[PDB]
Design a protein around this ligand. Structure first.
Ligand SMILES: O=c1[nH]c(=O)c2nn[nH]c2[nH]1
Ligand SMILES: O=c1[nH]c(=O)c2nn[nH]c2[nH]1
Ligand SMILES: O=c1[nH]c(=O)c2nn[nH]c2[nH]1
Ligand SMILES: O=c1[nH]c(=O)c2nn[nH]c2[nH]1
Ligand SMILES: O=c1[nH]c(=O)c2nn[nH]c2[nH]1
Ligand SMILES: O=c1[nH]c(=O)c2nn[nH]c2[nH]1
Ligand SMILES: O=c1[nH]c(=O)c2nn[nH]c2[nH]1
Ligand SMILES: O=c1[nH]c(=O)c2nn[nH]c2[nH]1
Ligand SMILES: [Ar]
Ligand SMILES: [Ar]
Ligand SMILES: [Ar]
Ligand SMILES: [Ar]
Ligand SMILES: [Ar]
Ligand SMILES: [Ar]
Ligand SMILES: [Ar]
Ligand SMILES: [Ar]
Ligand code: NA
Ligand code: NA
Ligand code: NA
Ligand code: NA
Lengths: 295, 295, 295, 295
């Protein structure tokens, strides 16, 4: 036997940083959950009980907190890149650092019309995420995402003209509910290293905000033929609005809202055009995935 | 042995309802999770396998969807009173209906600063809840709540002057993070019946909104001496502003954000006034409860 | 406005304790999650920002770990009584201690049919719980429970003879799947104090085990007329077998397994006696409660 | 823009099947949760709103239930292979079927020493899983796994001789707790198709049981130098005991149990050799991964 692949590190590292403006007295908060996994010349830690090649997961945890102290935590693309670079540079035998970040929402409260200087609400479980793979002499590969964006539209969704055979029961429809939890990833062009990441810093927040606007606007306005057709329109406009994106990936669940036949009870009419009351289905769900790139 | 208490019914009944304005074409969506438990002459269903006294959990489920077809699902104080009253009136041998409702957020999307007619977003897992006990001959007891309202403030929270003995390690502080998930319940004056609930329907939405505003404002603005002192301020404001409330109850966790000492590392300074990066604590957590009434 | 009720303390305190037999070298592990809330002369901590009456949640946390160092953590009825009694005795102005404990399973591994001295497995998320209310001058109220015991039987469950009206669709059945997650509580006779709890310590483990055996056996063997009729049989057995119990309480969901009609497909037969493949239903679920006492 | 990758299907399909022995009256239950995602000539469903290339997710759901009716659901390697083959054969334009299965535990109850014919307990949340990728003219790729196997050992775990620098605080130790949730995957040699899968059916259950025995026994007996060293020993013996396995992958969290310094309180001694009471850490956690193959 031999080790073909190995990586280890600290998962589920919860971090908070506050910026306090001395000038304005205005405070700003950042909260995230970090995972750092390292690869390199570490096989003997598995094969020969040789811990001398291990940067302890505890020290990795320490390093996440120290990097946050000494560097920006935003945009998360940058923080991830700084943190992964530290590890391949500090340690000769470490050749890759995989950094995953979930950003939690802390939105400034508006109190009596006025933005508050140090109060915040979690206005969604919606996350902003990054996966930063820092690979010595191969560069930095960044995937940026939003996840847990939960949306529903009460009409202007259709599903008909699908294949029918001896396995098919689904009624064609021209008016239905469509609800999803959006997971959307944009894969950046390979970066040569930390310098190139720093060179594109302003694109990260701007690209995330645009991904979010295009998702919300397309969903709200498209008379959806299908989840497939609508998610594709989303990816195309995102690609068009950022040349540094190579691919856009949507993973979208179809969270069914079933019509309820109540006609067995006093001939109550609650289907097709009379559909008022529905049974949200917890499971199963449709799951539709698509990766879109440039021709 | 004898039955001292019994109740049975259907839990976790997912309901959606849409209103479609014919003139405007504006659609409005409502989603909730319902539980109904019945009491009454049912002893023998337990003691003697006499199913003749059971309204089947399935039928209670059917009745929830039918009631929603025939009645407004908002405010949930009303919907819950209607549904409870149905069972004790319909069935001679049923004497009490316990109706629990969790309302899920579907906030109308603004697209290009214009409110969309039929697209919605879940802005937070914040719930509005009701517990409605309809008891034949005693009337209707309604508790209304907001839960899962998650907030943080970065400063203007303190905790000093607490008891100190051989069990105390906690340092006094004049500046700390305060974070919580708000559980806030208002217990209404008993209602004589459905009619009286109906007659007060304009109070339910208004009281829930002022409950929310008072929670958000007081938390934002109070230079908190303690969770205890800040939550008492909220309760007494809500009481002062709605005379049909008998009691207000806060249940608030203290979601700790621990300072990190980094002085062991290159003399890095990250405590007291230098405190920038914190470790949010998943567990344990302070739990602070208070029921406030009229003197 | 005035405070009608208050309690505060630390929730979600994870504790592990190991016993190491010096002679044998057999180790035994205990893991639990603890919550302690105190009442007493604390009103002013809420009304007047008088922290002088607060035993800090942090100190309550420290006291939990210290009590565990100095005392046995089993049975949890005892541990909870010790911990509660500490607070009302230590502090003049504290008059009640509410102690909630969840015990996690660490079952000793058998390796080659030999019980291992220091290796353990979590066999199920089944918990043993206690709720211990220590009230100065009134004594100690203990509720003991098992929860998260998940069971299914494929036959020897029925449900026919239930009420039928314009709200009923459910077909009568003489053969069905019954599945549940058992929540079962036994309420002990009030105790005068810690001494009396101590004097009964051999009853706590034995009653929990016979509670478990009676649940498992009765469920396995009863040709169930209903959840109602089967859960009443369990309660009355446990009562008959422990005279210091005042009441037994089951809370049982009916986790439905729906027949699937496949006759639309190549005349496939999968209902009544042919019923082979079912669709387990996540929601909704029957919820059936019963408190049984002595006549 | 163009579609570079696409797959769609039904996730979270809950299935139950019962075998009833006419001879012995003995019943046996199987429960699982299935996901099927298809690829093929389906790009126009995304680019041209062309649903005519879509086997509806609803029909996929129907097909899962019908396959379960007409075929064995065990071993899950086989069921997955039958179900994925159906889709690439039935539909000319479908070229791959990705099938994921979680198997839930239903263990026969022992009542009074005797195995019960139709009663079952969920004796762990431990799962058995498969990923079956059926790719037209490339064959069948099976990954088998157990997950959610939670274990703890109170001693016979070590961690010393790790790298120390300006980032290191972790104390070396020669006696510590080690707890994990085991996720273990064995990747089978590529199969030419369904026929070859059927040819190896007896290896699937036998290989899973051996993976589980080797995990439990190695964990219990190894005086662990590290998670790395111990998980490697597990993979080697698994590879040695099944030639049809190409690789073994462990993903193991290190679920820290922290010592508690209580010496500040009456000089209480609870560290090193006096360590009795510990604080289980919810987060962060070490995460150690390794893929082992043949030299
Ligand atoms: O078993 C261990 N492996 C590691 O890599 C590690 N790092 N800190 N503690 C650890 N324990
Ligand atoms: O009532 C139903 N509505 C649906 O939309 C559906 N889809 N599959 N089965 C279904 N049943
Ligand atoms: O056991 C049962 N009890 C009930 O009250 C019930 N109602 N529907 N199905 C049921 N099954
Ligand atoms: O770092 C810490 N911060 C705190 O607020 C605290 N309270 N107890 N222990 C603590 N440690
Ligand atoms: O606001 C607080 N209230 C308390 O009771 C407490 N105890 N420790 N920290 C605390 N903070
Ligand atoms: O398929 C079903 N099985 C059931 O047991 C049931 N009860 N109500 N509706 C049902 N549908
Ligand atoms: O939008 C949809 N896409 C699908 O592929 C599908 N299948 N059933 N319903 C569906 N809805
Ligand atoms: O008290 C501690 N024990 C540990 O094992 C540890 N590891 N990192 N920090 C730690 N603190
Ligand atoms: Ar942060
Ligand atoms: Ar969509
Ligand atoms: Ar609703
Ligand atoms: Ar507060
Ligand atoms: Ar414990
Ligand atoms: Ar039962
Ligand atoms: Ar199954
Ligand atoms: Ar291990
Ligand atoms: Na390096
Ligand atoms: Na009645
Ligand atoms: Na006292
Ligand atoms: Na094909």
């Amino acid at each position: 036997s031999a080790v073909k692949a190995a990586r280890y590190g600290k998962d589920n590292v919860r971090v908070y940083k506050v910026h306090k403006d001395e000038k304005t007295g205005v405070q700003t908060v950042y909260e995230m959950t970090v995972c750092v996994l390292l690869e390199g010349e570490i096989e003997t830690s598995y094969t020969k009980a040789d811990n001398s090649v291990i940067v302890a997961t505890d020290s990795i945890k320490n390093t996440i907190y120290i990097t946050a102290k000494q560097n920006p935590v935003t945009p998360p693309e940058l923080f991830g890149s700084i943190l992964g670079t530290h590890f391949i540079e500090k340690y000769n035998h470490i050749h890759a650092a995989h950094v995953n970040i979930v950003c939690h929402r802390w939105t400034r409260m508006d109190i009596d019309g006025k933005p508050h200087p140090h109060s915040f609400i979690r206005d969604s479980e919606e996350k902003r995420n990054v996966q930063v793979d820092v690979v010595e002499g191969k560069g930095i590969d960044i995937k940026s995402s939003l996840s847990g964006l939960t949306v529903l539209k009460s009409t202007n969704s259709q599903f008909w003209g699908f294949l029918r055979d001896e396995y098919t029961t689904l009624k064609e429809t021209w008016d239905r509910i469509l609800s999803t939890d959006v997971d959307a990833t944009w894969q950046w062009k390979n970066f040569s290293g930390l310098q190139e990441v720093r060179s594109h810093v302003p694109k990260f927040d701007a690209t995330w905000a645009t991904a979010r606007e295009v998702t919300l606007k397309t969903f709200a306005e498209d008379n959806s033929a299908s989840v497939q057709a609508t998610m594709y329109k989303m990816a195309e406009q995102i690609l068009a609005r950022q040349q540094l994106i190579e691919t856009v990936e949507y993973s979208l669940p179809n969270k069914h809202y079933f019509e309820i036949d109540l006609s067995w009870h006093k001939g109550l009419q609650n289907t097709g055009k009379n559909a008022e009351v529905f049974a949200p289905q917890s499971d199963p769900n449709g799951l539709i995935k698509c990766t879109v790139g440039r021709s």
